[PDB]
């Protein structure tokens, strides 16, 4: 059995957790993982776009083919020797990794805080035995270039032009079945009571699917712009965004900087809000003091950690840590999504709130944490209200067909998109007066400024929901919406007068 995997994942896979072997669990997970009906491949709008050169790295299972050169055949040691010259730093990083030094882990003693790693090594080996990639008496020797890029525990030559692969999540999960299972279980735990978002979303398990099933990403002609979106949405496909290649250090994936490249910016500024809170500034001041090498479960005891981090908050669930980051999500970043606000007081939300409270009480009293979490929920709704009021105005204009160029210069978005008011596509595509300025402004008000306000509140950065983000920027958008609307009403009256004069 895999003790950290949710019942609902065994249920989804029609497996018996008391019975299933690693081999069977792996195979069921991968069948779902590779299936178009479950998100794999080019998705529903695949006819509208083609890969660019970098996509072979972004979605290897769909696009990757080995290079035509070099036309060489190689064994395990030749990977290392030739690459030691052709990609020298990859060889140096790999040599420094746990992957290349398995005997070290084997020789760990039980008074070593890293001792947990030897259990993990034995679990990996048992997984490989169940898959018959490893003899029941064989030790895993190393995890080398040939293993990840060709076939696990490969004993013979590989043809460079045929056998080379980019390791995808299913490759890693050959050994690391637990992590890969915990990750894939997001598909089964992130289910909204009223379908506020699609089942399994948002999550790392479906981030790629989410990217390619976005209308504007499929429809727009600026492929290189769109592929920067893909760069932030590759977790589903590859496991090296938090603990990067070729070091693959868990210590690294535990630092807040691991999450920042993706979890930042104008519509979800978590990096910015976290780093500026007391929590983040303490983590900056104290990073030199913590032992980042200990597992998350030991961070606060053995690690010395005394301020919270992204991984410690978001991987934690009921006093345990897994790669599933979805089990406490309530607001999901965009407070305006239909049904999210309405759901905030539900029993489902309240159990998830209780889970958060537990997280925070690693340090704060329950009372303190509940006090602050109430302020987050309510502050979030107050920003939502301010937005809703501005939207009523511009949205009226739309129904009346009175937005600038609306009836005169509003060309349709690229296929397969459908024309509409304030739609996500208008953030990545514009032509003529599609969108109008007021339309974009109320759109960004919700997308950017309300989301950032909620991020700031959730991440305990006061300036990030008051002066600097959230409220001040929303305030400005409201003021400029009201102001334009009045001018437009006045110009509309002045025009009425001029017909009447003729």
């Amino acid at each position: 059995d895999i003790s950290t995997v949710p019942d609902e994942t065994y249920d989804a896979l029609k497996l018996d957790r008391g019975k299933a072997t690693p081999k069977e669990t792996y195979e069921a997970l991968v069948k779902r993982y590779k299936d178009p009906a479950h998100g794999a491949g080019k998705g529903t709008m695949g006819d509208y776009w083609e890969p660019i050169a970098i996509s072979i790295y972004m979605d290897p299972n769909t696009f990757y083919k080995p290079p035509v050169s070099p036309k060489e055949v190689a064994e395990r040691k030749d990977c290392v020797e030739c690459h030691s010259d052709e990609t020298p730093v990859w060889v140096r990083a790999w040599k420094r990794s746990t992957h290349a030094n398995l005997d070290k882990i084997r020789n760990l003693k039980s008074d070593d805080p890293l001792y947990y790693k030897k259990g993990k090594l034995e679990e990996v080996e048992n997984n490989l035995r169940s898959m018959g990639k490893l003899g029941e008496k064989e030790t895993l020797k190393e995890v080398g270039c040939i293993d990840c890029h060709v076939d696990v525990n490969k004993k013979d030559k590989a043809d460079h032009t045929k056998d080379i692969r980019m390791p995808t999540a299913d490759t890693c999960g050959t050994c690391h079945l637990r992590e890969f299972a915990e990750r894939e279980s997001e598909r089964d735990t992130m289910v909204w009571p009223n379908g506020q978002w699609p089942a399994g979303r948002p999550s790392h398990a479906l981030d790629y699917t989410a990217n390619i099933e976005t209308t504007v990403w499929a429809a727009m002609p600026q492929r290189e712009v769109a592929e920067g979106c893909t760069m932030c949405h590759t977790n589903q496909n590859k496991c090296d965004n938090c603990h990067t290649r070729h070091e693959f250090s868990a210590a690294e994936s535990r630092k807040p900087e691991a999450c920042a490249t993706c979890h930042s910016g104008v519509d979800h500024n978590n990096w910015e809000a976290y780093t500026m809170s007391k929590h983040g500034k303490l983590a900056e001041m104290n990073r030199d003091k913590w032992n980042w090498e200990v597992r998350l479960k030991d961070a606060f005891s053995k690690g010395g950690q005394n301020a919270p981090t992204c991984a410690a908050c978001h991987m934690e669930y009921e006093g345990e840590y897994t790669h599933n980051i979805t089990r406490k999500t309530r607001w999901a970043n965009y407070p305006f999504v239909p049904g999210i606000a309405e759901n905030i007081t539900s029993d489902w939300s309240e159990a998830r709130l209780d889970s958060w409270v537990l997280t925070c009480t690693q340090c704060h009293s329950e009372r303190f944490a509940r006090s602050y979490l109430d302020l987050m929920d309510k502050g979030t709704l107050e920003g939502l209200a301010k937005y809703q009021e501005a939207n009523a105005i511009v949205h009226k204009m739309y129904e009346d067909g009175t937005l600038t160029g609306q009836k005169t210069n509003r060309p349709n978005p690229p296929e397969p998109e459908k024309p509409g008011f304030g739609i996500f596509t208008q953030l990545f595509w514009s032509k003529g007066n599609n969108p109008a300025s007021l339309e974009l402004k109320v759109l960004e008000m919700a997308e950017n400024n309300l989301a950032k306000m909620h991020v700031g509140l959730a991440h305990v950065n006061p300036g990030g929901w008051t002066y600097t983000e959230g409220w001040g920027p929303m305030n400005r958008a409201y003021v400029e919406i009201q102001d334009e609307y009045t001018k437009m009403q006045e110009l509309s009256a002045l025009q009425a007068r001029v017909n009447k004069l003729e």
């Binding site: 009223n194 379908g195 506020q196 239909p338 049904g339 606000a341 309405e342 759901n343 905030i344 007081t345 929920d377 309510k378 709704l381 107050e382 939502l384 209200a385 301010k386 937005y387 809703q388």
Partner: protein, 49 residues
């Protein structure tokens, strides 16, 4: 799937959950005539259910 309820009605509900139906509370979002709008809890607990 859920009946949409505006953000200010959610706040007013939350500010009344523990109240008697005749109690009055301040709006968290509304100002009219230089003053914070007041809301009767009976009116709001009503609108939600």
């Amino acid at each position: 799937s859920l009946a949409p309820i505006s953000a200010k009605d959610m706040l007013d509900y939350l500010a009344c959950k523990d109240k008697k139906p005749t109690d009055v509370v301040k709006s968290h979002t509304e100002v009219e005539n230089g003053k914070i709008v007041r809301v009767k809890c009976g009116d709001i607990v009503a609108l939600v259910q």
